[PDB]
């Protein structure tokens, strides 16, 4: 895409990251922290027909 | 930090027993140093106190004391250059080096203060240089130059004959205000004597060693009665390298 | 400057101060401005 | 055509290392025209003249920089000194033109609030040129622009001395000043 | 271009030694100058309330004296 | 109507008498000079000849 | 294609009956346009 | 800070907005330096009351 | 983090400016990764434990994980009626107090991080420093093209020397003798009996590696401390010069810029130290320590 | 405030920074100050960068910088010929004259009195702007103020209407000469447009320089003559 | 050295000709041959008397009077 | 010494390693590298000429010669402004001092022709001191200027005692006096403030030391027949290199 | 500007001054020698044709006796040099070099006068006359004989 | 920048307050984030790389690079002076 | 706002800066995080007791004393220094910590760290060397405020001539109009000029 983001686009994400704590380390970093909706889960496990 | 730490103070491996008074007094000094140094840079002028190439923490070893050399350097030479920058800054001879103020306001009454200041300034510069913290054995290009002049059916004590002549003319100066230089006259060596108001460049000679026989130059170290001991001691802290590499360019 | 120096010494005396005190004087105008003085004119 | 030999490794470097002082060997070849079996030739003199005037570009440039740039920062400060070194280095070695390199010099970044720092140090803005010329001689003596070192300084000095005599001796019409299409003889 | 960028008239026309006192051959640009300290003196005087012309004379007389 | 970078834009026409344009920097540093962006007679309808 | 443009299209004069046309003007024009082109990263940075 | 009518004395709300604009700028990616100051339009000598 | 970034940057610059050796950045980052996994392995179990804060008199009980994850809030029902705001600020103060406690333990374990990582970087600086070829000068000495001039201020320092002028004495020797004393002990009368005492079984366990069965984690044998004698081990510049001089020039160039900047760090830490204890002044007054060069 | 009397006794006003800065010591200081000459101003895409004065492409000057006489005269300075140099003093920073028009089209000529004395009954002050025949000096030549030109045309051609100025001529010519500024005789107004005048002066002062040189070389000739005539 | 506003055009060299932009017109600008391209910014004044770029205009599917193109 | 094959022809430290082989070793079994076989006159070619061999050689020589660290004024030598060695003032100073030591200078002026083995088997008695160790530290202190060792320094304290006193005569109360004291085994002349020997320099480069030292040629650095040696040296004059 | 202390309308019939200046010496001499002016000391010495330096040094050590030996010679040289242009000699030059060198780094801000002196230092080297020659060669101020030599 | 020393103090600006830096009140020791060095390799690439390094190996000369990789080293009189040792691209000539 | 400025890790004062930590005048405890700057060992050492002095006695610190407490490094004398920072950081180009560190530090050096264009006789100093003595005597180590009021009652009675009544030249409160000509010109608005002299 050729969107141009203003200089401080990342502040919303940045305060959500500075404040969001996690019950323990593994919820902090697990491989499915990206996947948020069924669209995300199918676009992930679509290759994996099993 | 070296650029802020005031010009005379000495940082230390701080003792950590630094009392409030211990700290507040040294800050009071530093604030004094601050304004005297913002004052120096407007009392200042063309010439400056030549830095010396060696430590003088204590005395120049086995010759002079910390206090005695700090006397001459810090007060008397700073005086000389300060009155030189009083006197040359603002006269038809301004701001060309000592080597041209000397020579173009030399042998003159109507600029007598000028020439006196100039010559004494240089003189101090050269004594400063000619010292060295633990003495230089007379080199092999130099000792033979002194053999060619003062070898009269002699032994290894020919530079000793020249030291003899040094002490001799030190004492044959009596005013106790002046300078004894070993020079090279453009034909031969001769330990020339120097009033207060002259230099080997007013005398057109090649200064090869600079001795300072001003009464004040040893008043604190041995007093006027130890002048012979001083004219001796000066040779455990003279720089015959400076001497010799000046002599060689002098000849050719 | 003669009269003003006299005035300043008299001011110091009626004030209870020495005469060689570093004292400047200043008009206090009808409009609460203040305007220092240095001269006789 | 002034086509430089396209270099190589060992062989061009043999021909190129065994060169020795080209300026001298040119002079040798010019004078040898005084022997019996040869005549002194303007072609030999001109090969000498160009082998000596090879560094014309860098010299005319650095002279312009020292003496036509009112207030060039602190050239002795390694910042502007590096601007100077890199520009003159690429003025020789042909990668830059004289004109564009001079614009790179007078445009490089020096110090924030530049006019404000200047109007504190300079009445009419045009500073002392000794820092400049010392910087340029340092430039051409750090970069081996010359084989015989004192030559750098001498040309740098004498060209300046000679110009010091002209009327408007320090203004240059930007067109003719450096290279462009139409120049001066 | 920031690089190619660019009272004491009377403190000069009244004393040619006052001008050149650091600047005869090449402006000695690190020593405080008599023209300078006389400008400073001038402003101190005019704020002490001496008229323009009279601060001119008093500045020049103080310079001549210190000479 | 359009101003360059290092070129100073218009000066503000002061009041007529222009005695107080330096007295209203009495709050300012004592020694301030006349402001370069101030003018007694800056008229931008001044027809040049 | 000598530049490597996979998705591009240049049009000159609106049509090849529109004068002036010449091999000179064609090469000159396309190279002039490719010069005038600004990168996207340069567009962005220019807009900060 | 543009607030001269109250001598830059920040209200509670203004300080809550400023706590966020200060770090909204000191968290942007093209922020090398953040010159924080008072825009006294000629109406105050105060930085931040 | 930047404590250990500063530390290892200065150690890099050391092992290069004190010896012509370069540390392989492979290693430079294996060090920082070991500190980062130090912190992950602390944080792991820190997230199985709780800190309890409590607001006024203990009416709000906030149960938290020391990293600051609020898990539970038992409230007194005299607080449900404060307001929406003052409820917020009170649970927030109870959270804040618990955070103070958890961060108290967090800083009590970051000193353990400092100390294990220090036991780690021991044999490396002990390598560069506890060798016959390790020497400095006084920081005031005007280092000249040919050596080091003298200082003028604060005469007669106290040059230490960390090394026995006698024959070599190394930690491997000390540790082998340690096990020998241990051996003679566990042979000796108080030895063999204290060993059958709890004080001995406890030591055996908490410090006997060679007794870990086949399978247990930890050192499974006894280890001598590490030996990295720099001035007697060309570390990387050999490999760099062999393979390519470009990487050599830049690797040494970084190590040198790193030591240079740790020097600038000491310089500005000293600069504040002086403006604190009255040595220096807040704006240059002493130019001749820069303008006479 | 209301009650500041206590600590307002020792108030710490602001310091004179403007003055301090203006009185710092400048690397560009000059004994006698001279306002620099005008730069070339871009006159169009047809005309390129030209100065206004005559169209120069540079900034007319003689010496820019504080050194350029010293740097030129260095070796003299290191052998000490520049300690007494008055050739490095009079002309260390000599900059060219105001070779221009301070008010070109003549807005400041004449002087305000001259207007009020420019009426119809005033052939005396008329005839000090008309040629010896009554002609106006053309605007390129004697640049007058427009109001002056208006009052002058009507004043002359009203005096001539009532016959109180000659229908042709200049009856007040030599009397008027006292006001008209005799310039190309002795004094050198550096802002003249006659170049014959400038060349007379360049000669005459080059005449005198050559005269020093002549006198002293013939004195040296006399000396070498007196040598053999007095010793042999 | 060069202006950030590379080009800036009015939607209409005339005032008597108002060019209302269909939301599909404004969606076929941000679609350069399959690459979503918010590069050239187009200002259009909607019906709500708001003045917005085409990007927020087609994120809410309203089209407005054409005001300017710029990039 | 680059492992690359273009580097070794222009033997990098050719003239310097020549200077070191001339000064610090005997002319009888030693090397000398020649600008004849060396490419560009042995020296680097000027800028414009070579299409870049000399360029990249100067650049590698630069980056290997750049100095790093803080200097006595508080700046890396390439800080923006704080210049060092201005007009070679550091080598000026180091000439106008030279790295010259009182104690070894006196040991010289005492022995002044003796063979070191002679002096050593003198000062070491039968059982007093080991001639091996005393010779070792004797040499490593004599040339390659170090602080003299403990044992050798005490042997000096006894042997030079006359010249030691002749140095210690005219002191007033406050000045330094050459006191060969080893209270603690710290040989650093800043730890002694340079009194345990007469050293300005808290640690001297062994080799610039030995360069000045061997230019002090009172040692028999020429094993030739003497009148021939001096005849050749005089006739071939002062430009004998 | 007319420099300071330099009088313009000063004649010879204007009485003689007292200041030891180059201008004062030159005008007093204009009265004294009538018309002799030397381009250096050595024009005077070529005029005197065999009077060495010592041949006037002794004269003046006699003429004014409170002067020392070399100081007599110095008065000699200085009056020469002051009614002349100062001399180019290895004597004066080694004076300058040794002296500025014992003087050292200066207090002008950018080592300014040091750089002035060093730009002087290499201006009187052989290398400068070498390059001056090379430059003149590039200009052809010479002839066939020069080429042959 | 790394050469010219100025500014290397800022990486240790945190030692303004000695007590504060030892105390580690705010993690924000960093000039740009949490650490002095956080993501020196990625995060700085966020800026439009307008002036990129390009080819910068001095391993073998500009000449030998141009020569191995380009049909221009064969044709020396063609490349003008500036571009001489530069190109690594095989240029096809099309004579319009 | 005191804490705002003095706690930003680059707090460039000017000659217009002046920290009015004057709290209790409104009957409040002083607030604003500057109290710990005042309880810095460094101030308590350099101008001892002045720590308590500024709290209790409503007094303003200034550019110079803010500098000497060791508070802020930077200090400008330039105009529109915000703009001169902005355009410098425009001309800057690389956003890498190695590059911002220089593009920043260099501006600090050039326009801010008081090098070679400064003078202590030029900075507003409100604890000038005398005042330092005054205050260390009067305000240091007196565990109350009634303490200080007795301890200062005495120092009002101590006459002018005592060996501890140190005078001070005062940067006196300027008048309103600085000149009597200005006073008369100010009056002439409240009067009627006469139609002849």
Secondary structure of residue N66 in the 3-state scheme: helix
Question: J187-207 b/e with 16+ CB inside 10 Å = b?
Answer: ebeeeeeeeebeeeeeeeeee
- What are the CA-CA distances from residue H23 to residues H17, H20, I113, I174, O103 (Å)? 10, 5, 31, 55, 21
Please provide residue I30's backbone torsions phi and psi, each rounded to the nearest 5 degrees: -60, -30
* Experiment used for this model: cryo-EM
Instruction: Report yes or no: I276 and O70 within 8 Å, Cβ to Cβ.
Output: yes
Is the distance from CB of L91 to CB of I145 less than 8 angstroms? Answer: yes
**Tokens matching residue A40:** 């995300």
Q: b/e per residue, O40-52, with b = 16+ CB within 10 A?
A: bbbbbbbbbbbbb
User: What's the rounded Cα separation, in Å, for the pair D104 and B216?
Assistant: 60
Residue pair B121/B84 in contact by the 8 Å Cβ criterion: yes
Contact flag O87-D112 (C-beta cutoff 8 Å):
yes
Say if D and E touch: at least 3 Cβ pairs within 8 Å. yes
Q: What is the CA radius of gyration of chain L?
A: 23
Identify the CA nearest to B91 among candidates N53, M114, K22, M20. Answer: M20
Breaks (C-N over 2.5 A) in chain B follow: none
On whether the CB atoms of residues L141 and L149 are closer than 8 A, the answer is: yes
Please name the residue that has the structure tokens 């800057």: O92
Compute CA distances M59 → B173, D89, M32, M68, M69, whole Å.
26, 61, 19, 12, 10
Kindly list the distances between the CA atom of residue O8 and the CA atoms of C3, H35, M32, O141, in Å, as whole numbers in the listed order: 56, 10, 79, 31
The CA-based angle O50-O51-O53, given to 5 degrees, is 55
Number of neighbouring beta carbons within 10 Å of residue B24: 19
| Distance, CA of O149 to CA of K2 (rounded, Å) | 69
Decide: J13 and E5 in contact? Cβ < 8 Å: no
Q: Which helix (H) or strand (E) holds O18?
A: strand O18-19
Rounded to 5°, angle at Cα D140 from D136 and D144: 165
Contact partners, residue D98, CB within 8 Å, separation at least 6: D57, D60, D61, D64, D91, D178, D179
User: What's I210-275 look like in SS3?
Assistant: HHCCCCCCCCCCCCCCCCCCHHHCCCCHHHHHHHCHHHHHHHHHHHHHHHHHHHHHHHHHHHHHHH
Number of H helices, E strands in chain B: 10, 3
Provide CB contacts within 8 A for B138, sequence distance 6+.
B146, B159, B240, B244
Place of tokens 């040119």: D26
Burial annotation J2-31 (CB, 10 A radius, 16+ → b, else e) = eeeeeeeeeebebbbbbbbbbbebbbbbbb
Buried-exposed string I148-164: b where 16+ CB fall within 10 A, e elsewhere? bbbbeeeeebebeeeee
CA distances from I149 to I178, L100, L203 (A): 45, 12, 8
Burial-class residue O108 by CB neighbours within 10 Å (0-12, 13-18, 19+): buried
Q: Which chains touch K (3 or more CB pairs under 8 A)?
A: A, G
Backbone angles phi, psi at B23, to 5 degrees: -85, -40
> CA I261, CA N11: separation in Å to the nearest integer?
9
Asked if M119 lies within 8 A of J74 by C-beta distance, the reply is yes
Interface contact O89, partner H, CB < 8 A? yes
Helix (H) or strand (E) holding I100: helix I85-129
**In the structure, do chain L and chain H come into contact, i.e. share 3 or more CB pairs under 8 Å?**
no
Chains contacting B with at least 3 CB pairs below 8 Å?
E, I, J, L, M, O
- Beta carbons within 8 Å of K28's beta carbon, 6+ residues apart: none
Quick check: O31 and O25 in contact, CB under 8 A?
no
Secondary structure (3-state) at B98? helix
Tell me which residue of L179, L160, L157 sits closest to L168, measured CA to CA.
Answer: L179
F39 has which bridge partners?
A: F13
L221 within 8 A of L213, measured Cβ to Cβ: no
Per-residue DSSP letter, K20: B
Which residue reads 């101590």 in tokens? O158
Judge H/A contact: 3 or more CB pairs < 8 A. Answer: yes
Q: Cβ of I110: how many Cβ atoms within 10 Å?
A: 17
Q: DSSP secondary-structure letter at J179? A: T
Start-to-end CA span in chain H (Å): 11
CB pairs under 8 A between G and K: 10
Model resolution, angstroms: 3.5
What's the number of CA atoms in the CB half-sphere (13 Å) around residue L102? 32
Nearest CA in chain O to H29: O95
Q: Which residue of M has its CA nearest to D47?
A: M138
The span from the CA of B178 to the CA of B196, in Å, is 5
Q: Which phi and psi (to 5°) does residue H32 adopt? A: -90, -45
Check the CA dihedral L109-L111-L115-L116 and report its sign: negative
Which I residues 150-169 touch B at CB under 8 Å?
150-155, 157
Please indicate if any CB of chain I lies within 8 Å of the CB of N4: no
Residue in M103, M116, M120 to test binding to B, most B beta-carbons within 10 Å: M103
CA dihedral J119, J124, J125, J128 (to 10 degrees): 140
Degrees to nearest 5, angle at CA B181 with B176 and B182: 140
Helix H segments across H1-49?
Answer: 12-25
**Which has the closest alpha carbon to J10: C21, O46, O128, O180?**
O128
CA dihedral for D52, D53, D55, D58, sign (positive or negative): positive
Inspect the interface and report whether the beta carbons of L75 and N58 lie closer than 8 Å.
no
CB contact at 8 A, N85 and L52: yes
Instruction: Determine how β-strand F12-13 pairs with β-strand F38-39.
Output: parallel
Mutation choice for D interface testing from O87, O110, O113 by most D CBs within 10 A? O110
Which residues of chain N have a CB within 8 Å of the CB of L78?
3-5
Q: What are phi and psi of H25, to 5 degrees?
A: -85, -40
SS3 J42: strand
Tokens for H16?
């809550």
Q: Which two structure tokens, joined as six digits, stand for E22?
A: 């650091």
CA-nearest of J27, J25, J26, J32 to J93 is J32
> Cα separation of O147 and O144, whole Å?
5
Q: Does residue M78 contact residue B107 with C-beta atoms inside 8 Å?
A: yes
- Residue L94 CA to chain centroid, in angstroms? 12
Counting beta carbons within 10 angstroms of the beta carbon of residue L175, is it exposed (0 to 12), middle (13 to 18) or buried (19 or more)? buried
Dihedral pair phi/psi, residue C27, rounded to 5°: -40, 145
Partners of M107 on chain E (C-beta within 8 Å) are 30
G43: closest chain K residue by CA? K4
């Amino acid at each position: 895409k050729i969107t141009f983001y203003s200089d401080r686009f990342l502040f919303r994400d940045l305060v959500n990251r500075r404040e969001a704590s996690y019950a323990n380390v593994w919820e902090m970093d697990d491989p499915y922290r990206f996947l948020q909706t069924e669209q995300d889960y199918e676009d992930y496990w679509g290759d994996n027909y099993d | 930090y070296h650029a802020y730490v005031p010009k005379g103070a000495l940082l230390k491996t701080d003792m950590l027993a630094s009392s409030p008074q211990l700290v507040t007094a040294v800050f009071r000094e530093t604030e004094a140093a601050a304004e005297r140094a913002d004052r120096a840079n407007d009392y200042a002028g063309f010439f400056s106190r030549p830095r010396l190439n060696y430590p003088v923490a204590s005395g120049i070893p086995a010759f002079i004391s910390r206090r005695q050399f700090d006397v001459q350097y810090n007060i008397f030479h700073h005086d000389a250059v300060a009155t030189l920058n009083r006197h040359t800054l603002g006269t038809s001879l301004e701001g060309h080096s000592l080597e041209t103020v000397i020579r173009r306001a030399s042998f003159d009454a109507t600029q007598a203060a000028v020439h006196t200041a100039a010559a004494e300034h240089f003189n101090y510069c050269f004594f400063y240089k000619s010292l060295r913290p633990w003495g230089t054995a007379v080199p092999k290009q130099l000792r033979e130059a002194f053999q060619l002049q003062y070898g009269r059916d002699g032994s290894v004590d020919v530079v000793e004959e020249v030291k003899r002549l040094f002490t001799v003319v030190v004492l044959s100066h009596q005013e106790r205000c002046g300078w004894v230089y070993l020079v090279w006259t453009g034909k031969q060596f001769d330990v020339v004597e120097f009033p207060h108001g002259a230099c080997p460049i007013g005398s057109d000679l090649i200064p090869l060693l600079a001795i300072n026989v001003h009464e004040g130059a040893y008043s604190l170290d041995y007093g006027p009665s130890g002048l012979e001991q001083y004219a001796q001691n000066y040779f455990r802290a003279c720089n015959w390298f400076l001497a010799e590499r000046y002599y060689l360019q002098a000849t050719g | 400057t003669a009269c003003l120096d006299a005035l300043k010494r008299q001011v110091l005396t009626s004030f209870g101060m020495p005469d060689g005190r570093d004292i400047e004087l200043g008009w206090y105008l009808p409009t609460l401005d203040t305007c220092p003085i240095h001269n006789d004119v | 055509q002034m086509i430089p030999k396209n270099l190589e490794g060992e062989r061009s470097r043999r021909e190129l290392m065994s060169r020795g002082d080209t300026e001298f060997e040119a002079l040798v070849e010019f004078i040898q025209g005084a022997s019996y079996d040869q005549l002194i030739s303007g072609r030999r003199f001109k090969k000498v003249y160009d082998k000596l005037s090879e560094n014309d570009d860098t010299f005319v440039w650095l002279c312009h920089t020292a003496m036509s740039v009112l207030n060039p920062g602190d050239v002795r400060s390694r910042l502007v000194y590096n601007h100077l070194r890199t520009l003159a280095e690429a003025v020789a070695n042909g990668e830059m033109t004289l004109r564009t390199a001079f614009r790179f010099y007078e445009s490089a970044v020096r110090s924030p609030a530049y006019r404000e720092i200047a109007k504190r140090q300079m009445e009419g803005g045009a500073a002392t040129r000794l820092a400049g010329i010392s910087a340029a001689a340092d430039v051409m003596r750090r970069m081996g622009l010359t084989r015989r070192p004192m030559a750098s300084y001498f040309e740098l000095y004498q060209r300046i001395v000679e110009r010091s005599e002209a009327m408007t001796p320090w203004g240059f019409p930007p067109l003719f000043q450096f290279e462009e299409r139409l120049s001066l003889e | 271009e920031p690089t190619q960028d660019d009272l004491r008239d009377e403190l000069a026309r009244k004393s040619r030694l006052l001008a050149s006192e650091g600047m005869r051959y090449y402006n000695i640009f690190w020593v405080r100058k008599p023209l300078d300290r006389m400008e400073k003196e001038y402003y101190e005087l005019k704020r002490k309330g001496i008229a323009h012309s009279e601060a001119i004379k008093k500045v020049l007389e103080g310079f001549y004296k210190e000479l | 109507v359009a101003f360059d970078f290092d070129d100073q834009l218009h000066p503000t026409r002061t009041l007529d008498n222009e005695g107080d344009s330096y007295a209203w920097c009495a709050e300012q540093d004592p020694t301030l000079g006349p402001h370069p962006d101030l003018d007694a007679s800056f008229d931008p309808n001044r027809r040049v000849f | 294609c000598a530049f490597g443009f996979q998705h591009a299209g240049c049009r000159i004069n609106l049509k090849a009956t529109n004068n002036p046309k010449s091999p000179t003007h064609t090469v000159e024009g396309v190279f002039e346009a490719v010069k005038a082109l600004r990168s996207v990263s340069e567009i962005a940075a220019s807009r900060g | 800070i543009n607030e001269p009518k109250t001598h830059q004395a920040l209200s509670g709300k203004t300080a809550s907005e400023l706590s966020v604009e200060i770090d909204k700028a000191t968290n942007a990616v093209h922020s090398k330096l953040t010159v924080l100051e008072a825009a006294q339009s000629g109406l105050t000598n105060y930085y931040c009351g | 983090m930047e404590v250990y970034r500063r530390i290892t940057e200065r150690v890099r610059g050391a092992l290069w400016a004190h010896h012509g050796r370069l540390m392989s950045e492979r290693q430079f980052h294996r060090i920082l990764a070991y500190v980062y996994n130090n912190k992950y392995e602390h944080q792991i179990r820190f997230d199985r434990m709780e800190v309890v804060g409590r607001a006024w008199e203990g009416r709000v009980e906030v149960v938290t994980t020391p990293a600051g994850y609020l898990k539970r809030v038992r409230v007194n029902p005299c607080l449900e009626e404060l307001s929406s705001y003052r409820q917020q600020q009170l649970i927030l103060a109870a959270y804040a107090d618990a955070c103070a406690q958890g961060r108290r333990l967090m800083e009590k374990a970051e000193i353990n991080i400092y100390k294990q990582f220090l036991k780690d970087l021991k044999p490396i600086v002990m390598g560069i420093r506890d060798n016959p070829e390790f020497y400095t000068v006084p920081e005031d000495s005007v280092e000249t093209v040919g050596g080091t001039l003298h200082m003028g201020q604060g005469p007669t320092p106290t040059t230490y020397r960390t090394i026995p002028a006698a024959k070599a004495h190394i930690p491997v020797d000390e540790i082998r003798a340690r096990q020998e004393w241990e051996k003679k002990w566990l042979n000796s009368p108080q030895g063999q009996s204290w060993a059958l005492t709890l004080r001995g079984k406890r030591y055996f366990a908490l410090h006997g590696p060679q007794y870990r069965p086949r399978g247990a984690p930890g050192a499974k044998k006894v280890t001598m401390p590490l030996d990295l004698p720099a001035p007697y081990t060309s570390m990387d510049e050999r490999r760099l010069l062999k393979k390519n001089w470009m990487a050599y020039l830049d690797n040494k160039h970084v190590a040198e810029v790193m030591w240079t900047r740790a020097k600038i760090a000491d310089r500005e830490k000293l600069q504040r130290r002086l403006q604190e204890t009255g040595q220096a002044w807040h704006r240059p007054i002493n130019k001749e320590a820069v303008s006479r060069w | 405030s209301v009650y500041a009397n206590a600590m307002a006794q020792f108030a710490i006003c602001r310091q004179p920074w403007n003055e301090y800065i203006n009185l710092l010591t400048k690397q560009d200081s000059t004994p006698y100050h001279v306002e620099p000459q005008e730069k070339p101003a871009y006159r169009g895409r047809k005309r390129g960068r030209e100065g206004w004065l005559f169209g120069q492409q540079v900034q007319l000057h003689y010496h820019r910088f504080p050194d350029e006489q010293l740097l030129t005269n260095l070796t003299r300075w290191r052998t000490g010929e520049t300690v007494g140099d008055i050739a490095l003093q009079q002309f260390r920073n000599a900059q060219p004259f105001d070779i221009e028009d301070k008010d070109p089209q003549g807005m400041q000529r004449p002087s305000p009195e001259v207007y009020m004395k420019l009426n119809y009954k005033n052939p005396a002050t008329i005839s000090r702007f008309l040629t010896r025949t009554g002609h106006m000096y053309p605007a390129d030549i004697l640049p007058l103020n427009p109001e002056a030109v208006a009052k002058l045309r009507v004043a002359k051609a009203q005096a001539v209407r009532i016959g109180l100025y000659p229908r042709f001529g200049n009856p007040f010519w030599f009397r008027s000469q006292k006001f008209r500024p005799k310039a190309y005789q002795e004094n050198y107004d550096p802002t003249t447009y006659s170049t014959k005048h400038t060349m007379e002066h360049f000669a005459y002062n080059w005449v005198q320089t050559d005269r020093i040189r002549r006198y002293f070389k013939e004195l040296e000739e006399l000396q070498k003559n007196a040598s053999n005539g007095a010793r042999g | 050295g060069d202006s950030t506003i590379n080009v800036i055009e009015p939607c209409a060299y005339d005032g008597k000709t108002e060019f209302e932009w269909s939301p599909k017109m404004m969606r076929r600008l941000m679609n350069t041959h399959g690459i979503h391209n918010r590069l050239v910014v187009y200002i259009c004044r909607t019906a709500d008397n708001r003045v917005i770029d085409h990007i927020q205009a087609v994120k809410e599917n309203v089209g407005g009077r054409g005001l300017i193109m710029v990039h | 010494q680059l492992n690359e094959s273009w580097w070794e022809p222009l033997e990098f430290g050719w003239e310097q390693h020549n200077k070191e082989q001339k000064a610090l070793v005997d002319p009888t079994e030693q090397r000398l590298i020649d600008s004849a076989s060396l490419p560009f006159g042995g020296k680097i070619p000027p800028f414009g000429t070579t299409i870049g061999i000399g360029e990249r050689i100067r650049e590698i020589a630069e980056d290997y010669a750049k100095g790093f660290g803080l200097g006595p004024h508080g700046h890396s030598p390439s800080h923006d402004t704080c210049q060092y060695n201005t007009l070679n003032a550091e080598e000026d100073r180091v000439r106008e001092l030279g790295y010259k030591d009182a104690l070894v200078r006196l040991f010289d002026e005492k022995m002044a022709d003796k063979d070191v083995h002679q002096w050593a088997v003198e000062q070491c008695a039968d059982g007093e001191a080991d001639v091996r160790q005393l010779l070792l530290s004797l040499h490593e202190w004599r040339e390659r200027g170090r602080p003299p060792s403990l044992m050798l320094l005490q042997v000096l304290s006894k042997y030079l005692e006359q010249e030691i006193a002749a140095f210690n005569e005219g002191v007033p109360s406050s000045v330094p006096k050459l006191s060969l004291q080893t209270v603690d085994g710290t040989l650093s002349p800043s730890g002694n403030s340079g009194e345990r020997s007469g050293t300005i320099w808290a640690d001297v480069e062994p080799t610039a030391y030995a360069l000045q030292y061997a230019s002090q040629a009172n040692h028999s650095s020429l094993d030739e027949p003497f009148i021939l040696q001096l005849l050749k040296s005089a006739q071939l004059g002062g430009r004998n290199a | 500007y007319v420099p300071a202390g330099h009088n313009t309308l000063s004649s010879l019939r204007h009485e003689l001054r007292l200041e030891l200046t180059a201008q004062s010496l030159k005008e007093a001499w204009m009265r004294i020698s009538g018309g002799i002016y030397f381009q250096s000391a050595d024009d005077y010495y070529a005029s005197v044709d065999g009077l060495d330096a010592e041949q006037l040094g002794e004269v003046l050590a006699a003429l004014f006796p409170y002067l020392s030996t070399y100081e007599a010679q110095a008065l000699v040289q200085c009056t020469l040099d002051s009614i002349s242009k100062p001399m180019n000699t290895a004597s004066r030059q080694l004076s300058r070099t040794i002296t500025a060198e014992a003087v050292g780094l200066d207090n002008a801000p950018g080592h300014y006068t040091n750089f002035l002196d060093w730009m002087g230092r290499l201006t009187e080297t052989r290398g400068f006359k070498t390059e001056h020659a090379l430059f003149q060669f590039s200009r052809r101020k010479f002839n066939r004989d020069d080429v042959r030599v | 920048f790394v050469d010219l020393e100025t500014g290397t103090s800022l990486y240790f600006r945190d030692t303004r307050d000695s007590a504060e830096a030892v105390a580690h009140a705010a993690d924000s020791k960093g000039l740009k984030g949490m650490d002095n060095a956080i993501d020196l390799y990625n995060e700085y690439r966020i800026v439009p790389d307008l002036y990129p390094e390009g080819f910068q190996w001095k391993h073998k000369l500009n000449t030998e690079y141009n020569q191995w990789r380009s049909n221009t080293w064969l044709t020396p009189d063609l490349i003008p002076q500036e571009h001489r040792g530069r190109f690594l691209c095989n240029f096809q000539l099309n004579i319009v | 706002g005191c804490g705002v400025s003095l706690y930003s890790k680059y707090c460039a004062l000017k000659d217009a800066s002046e920290f009015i930590f004057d709290g209790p005048n409104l009957g409040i405890t002083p607030y604003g995080g500057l109290t710990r700057l005042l309880a810095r060992p460094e101030t308590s050492l350099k101008y001892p007791g002045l720590a308590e002095f500024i709290m209790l006695t409503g007094t303003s610190l200034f550019a110079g004393d803010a500098l000497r407490l060791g508070w802020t490094d930077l200090f400008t004398t330039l105009p529109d220094m915000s703009y001169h920072i902005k355009d410098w950081f425009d001309t800057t180009e690389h956003m890498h910590n190695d590059a911002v560190a220089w593009q920043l530090g260099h501006l600090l050096e050039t326009c801010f760290k008081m090098k070679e264009a400064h003078s202590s006789a030029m900075e507003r100093v409100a604890i000038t060397p005398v005042r330092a003595r005054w205050i260390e005597d009067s305000f240091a180590d007196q565990p109350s405020v009634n303490h200080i009021i007795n301890t200062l009652s005495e120092i009002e009675r101590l006459p002018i001539t005592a060996k501890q009544n140190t005078c001070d030249q005062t940067r006196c409160t300027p008048y309103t109009l600085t000149s009597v000509e200005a006073g008369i010109s100010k009056l002439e608005n409240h009067r009627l000029r006469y139609t002849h002299s």
